[PDB]
Design a protein around this ligand. Structure first.
Ligand SMILES: [Zn+2]
Ligand SMILES: [Zn+2]
Length: 588
């Protein structure tokens, strides 16, 4: 194992020769520990509050979920706590028959996903464009010396060696050299595996089960379309710590995509798979009585959560795992088959070739998140292969049948559920939703410290406009959104981001009129909206039924909420007076 990771550790140990030591009381049980060195503490025990959103959401000052979200611990203490809970475990090896079905399915699945698209290398110019369009990283990309280090590392990869590709459990911390090595490792991963994302291999059209690039505003419509397929209930089982359950067998199956690559691409992707996925060197902060140390650890399995290929590879493995579970529910795979090291291939290949694509269409898969509508309910108790592959469901005994839903509107997916609304004109909309306290709690969080009232107000406007576009059907959020937009100067451009979710298309990151953007998203560009008649007033943009809004957390009907609603122009004026003599519009 040291032959692949040795060079990386040597460079770290040499760079930190002053404080390098082997801490005898390191807490690592399933990860190989190499040593430690002193570091300045990274992270915070609490999150900074967005004063603009807080001032305009006074009734949520008395709400428990809002307080919890403001309490994210990212300090070395917090890092170690999560590590012990989840990360420091071993997944039992799947049985020989299970490994055979997984291999057959992975091979068939990669061929299916590659039917129209050819893998390709991604470029310095693409990486540069993505870094620029999103936004330290933008500065590194402009530096020619960053790219010469990338070239030097790439030459080692071509030789089957790695010198600087090290993953971090936290954030960035002589200082530009360590940062260039991190961003350079992300570039090389992007160059070799970025095609999965850049060329939309997991789009619904390409992958059948995937939803990559679809967007939050389409997810509900996709669940409603799956609901029309004849079969059993819709299942949406949560896996306990999916990334920790990715096995050596899963990684071997994922690597199969290299077979479809050109020789020059295959060499680079083979280097990413072998040196950074199947072997990894990780940095993790740890508090000590003396201060704070950085631990250097390694392992041969599990998924690195913050990697370019993580989303696509998790989606791939979950599509494979759910097809295997569907085969088991259908009686194609028995307990005897899973234990069998001489399992017959024939029935598996026949099911995949005749039913595979149809079975993929019964699913919505996004990383570890899945919804499956199997042909019948035998799937509920078909748990042998699911547990054996290591994808053990969260907070339920291993062998208790899964509970499915007979209404797509009750199905959890991507932290949301979806409602069908009827507009005043009779047209139907399918909208995303979640418990309201989660939406308000998140909008009240400002990421980082040392932010002016301007940057704070602009992030507040970004949240308000996200509510106008995605959660307009929630009475309190439409009201709060109108209040925030009335308090923030009309010409101020929303900055930073409301979410890192892959489903977010950030249509709210604009100073274009929100009703114009709403019509474009929900009417004009909506493929499930046959009648393109525009909505000319917010009065014609619908709400959830009052009862559903309350079931989803609305404060409508409470006296404190009626008080807030009555007194909102006052709070808006207070924000305006502190911002100054700028141009404001009254959205109330
Ligand atoms: Zn490397
Ligand atoms: Zn809801």
């Amino acid at each position: 194992n040291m032959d692949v990771i040795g060079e990386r550790i040597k460079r770290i140990k040499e760079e930190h020769n002053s404080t390098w030591h082997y801490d005898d009381e390191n807490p690592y049980k399933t990860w190989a520990y190499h040593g430690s060195y002193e570091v300045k503490a990274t992270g915070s025990a609490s999150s900074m509050i967005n004063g603009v959103v807080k001032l305009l959401t006074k009734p949520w000052d008395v709400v428990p979920m809002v307080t919890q979200m403001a309490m994210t611990d990212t300090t070395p203490f917090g890092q170690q706590r999560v590590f012990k809970e989840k990360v420091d475990t071993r997944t039992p090896r799947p049985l020989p028959g299970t490994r055979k079905v997984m291999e057959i399915t992975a091979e068939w699945l990669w061929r299916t996903l590659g039917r129209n698209k050819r893998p390709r290398l991604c470029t310095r110019e693409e990486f540069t464009k993505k870094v620029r369009t999103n936004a330290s990283a933008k500065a590194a990309v402009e530096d020619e010396e960053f790219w010469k280090l990338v070239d030097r590392e790439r030459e080692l990869h071509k030789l089957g060696k790695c010198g600087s590709c090290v993953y971090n459990m936290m954030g960035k911390r002589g200082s530009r050299a360590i940062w260039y090595m991190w961003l350079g490792v992300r570039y090389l991963e992007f160059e070799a595996l970025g095609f999965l994302n850049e060329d939309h291999w997991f789009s619904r059209e390409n992958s059948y089960s995937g939803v990559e690039g679809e967007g939050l505003h389409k997810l509900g419509y996709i669940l409603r379309d799956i609901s029309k397929i004849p079969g059993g209930a819709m299942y949406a089982d949560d896996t306990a710590g999916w990334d920790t359950r990715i096995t050596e067998d899963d990684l071997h199956n994922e690597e199969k995509i290299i077979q479809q690559m050109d020789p020059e691409h295959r060499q680079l992707a083979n280097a990413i798979f072998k040196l950074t996925y199947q072997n990894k060197v990780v940095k993790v902060q740890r508090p000590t009585p003396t201060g704070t140390v950085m631990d250097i650890i390694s392992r041969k399995d599990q998924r690195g959560s913050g990697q370019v290929g993580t989303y696509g590879l998790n989606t791939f493995t979950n599509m494979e795992a759910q097809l295997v579970r569907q085969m088991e529910g259908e009686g194609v795979l028995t307990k005897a088959d899973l234990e069998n090291p001489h399992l017959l291939e024939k029935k598996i290949t026949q099911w995949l070739e005749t039913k595979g694509v149809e079975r993929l269409k019964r699913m919505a898969i996004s990383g570890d998140d899945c919804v499956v509508k199997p042909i019948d309910d035998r799937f509920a108790n078909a748990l042998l292969a699911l547990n054996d592959m290591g994808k053990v469901r969260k907070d339920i005994p291993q062998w208790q049948p899964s509970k499915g839903w007979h209404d797509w509107q009750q199905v959890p997916f991507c932290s949301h559920h979806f409602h069908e609304l009827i507009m005043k004109d009779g047209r139907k909309l399918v909208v995303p939703c979640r418990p309201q306290d989660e939406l308000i709690g998140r909008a009240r969080i400002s990421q980082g410290a040392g932010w002016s009232l301007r940057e704070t107000a602009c992030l507040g406007k970004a949240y308000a406009q996200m509510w106008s576009l995605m959660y307009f059907h929630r009475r309190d959020l439409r009201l709060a959104s109108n209040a925030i937009c009335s308090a923030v100067p009309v010409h101020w451009v929303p900055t930073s981001r409301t979410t890192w979710s892959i489903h977010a298309h950030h249509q709210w990151m604009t100073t274009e009129d929100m009703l114009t953007v709403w019509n474009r998203v929900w009417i004009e560009e909506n493929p499930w909206m046959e009648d393109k008649t525009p909505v000319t007033t917010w009065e014609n943009v619908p709400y959830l039924g009052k009862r559903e809004d309350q079931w989803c957390g609305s404060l409508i009907g409470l006296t404190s909420r009626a008080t807030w609603a009555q007194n909102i122009p006052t709070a808006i004026q207070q924000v305006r007076s502190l911002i100054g003599n700028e141009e404001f519009l009254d959205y109330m």
